Amino acid sequence: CDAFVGTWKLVSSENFDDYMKEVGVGFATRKVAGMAKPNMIISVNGDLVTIRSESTFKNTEISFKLGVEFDEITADDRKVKSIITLDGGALVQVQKWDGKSTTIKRKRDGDKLVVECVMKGVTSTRVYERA
Amino acid sequence: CDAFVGTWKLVSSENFDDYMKEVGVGFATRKVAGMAKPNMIISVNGDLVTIRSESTFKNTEISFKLGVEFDEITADDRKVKSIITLDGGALVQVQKWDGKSTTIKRKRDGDKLVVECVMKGVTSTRVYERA
Numbered sequence A, B: 001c002d003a004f005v006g007t008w009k010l011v012s013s014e015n016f017d018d019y020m021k022e023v024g025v026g027f028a029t030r031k032v033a034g035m036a037k038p039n040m041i042i043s044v045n046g047d048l049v050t051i052r053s054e055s056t057f058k059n060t061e062i063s064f065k066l067g068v069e070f071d072e073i074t075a076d077d078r079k080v081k082s083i084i085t086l087d088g089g090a091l092v093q094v095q096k097w098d099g100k101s102t103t104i105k106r107k108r109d110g111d112k113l114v115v116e117c118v119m120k121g122v123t124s125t126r127v128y129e130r131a
Ligand SMILES: CCCCC[C@@H](O)/C=C/C=O
Pocket: A020, A023, A025, A033, A074, A075, A076, A104, A115, A117, A126
């Protein structure tokens, strides 16, 4: 799971607004979230994975074990159940809440970390590179 | 558990260096950790409690359920097991790792949030007030 380890900075964002729309994120947060260029810091300690996201918007962190469901408060303040798994080199996170769910796929593409977020057919894609 | 909810800023620190010494935190981190004036953001969402700590030093966050042990990577990068409990108005956190343990008691005193950290008889006390 070490291919993801390191510090990553956002270099491109696509369709993030309609992904957020689909998730139920409100207008004001969408403006601030869409203007942020977060760093994403990923580390592994033994079996424990950690992902820190650092924007002007918010600073969040999740710590989790692969394939063990955990409770999470997302940056837009949803309380979700998440499970994160490693699937052929992609880190795949499923978040469930209030009868909905969204998949967040983190994968390595050349020198890039590509994050694909899907919910109900709406996809957002954010690309990161090492800082 | 709502007495702790809100944003808190550090107003005083006492004996933090020897507490850190006792925990095993290294010289360089002790300098940077001791110069930080963190904000501490506490929220409750249903049964889920969250504590964000925001310094120039690091931004961390733990999310937990009361009385349910969780794995944590501390700001100084120890992997610990923590259990947090509510004991007569004090939020009490025990961290265990490598045969050691330390207790972090968060309590309300008038308008202050008082954090008392103990390990092997060495105590540190940090006082926060609402930001
Ligand atoms: C701020 C809106 C929350 C929706 C999830 C989105 O942030 C995923 C980002 C990944 O980099």
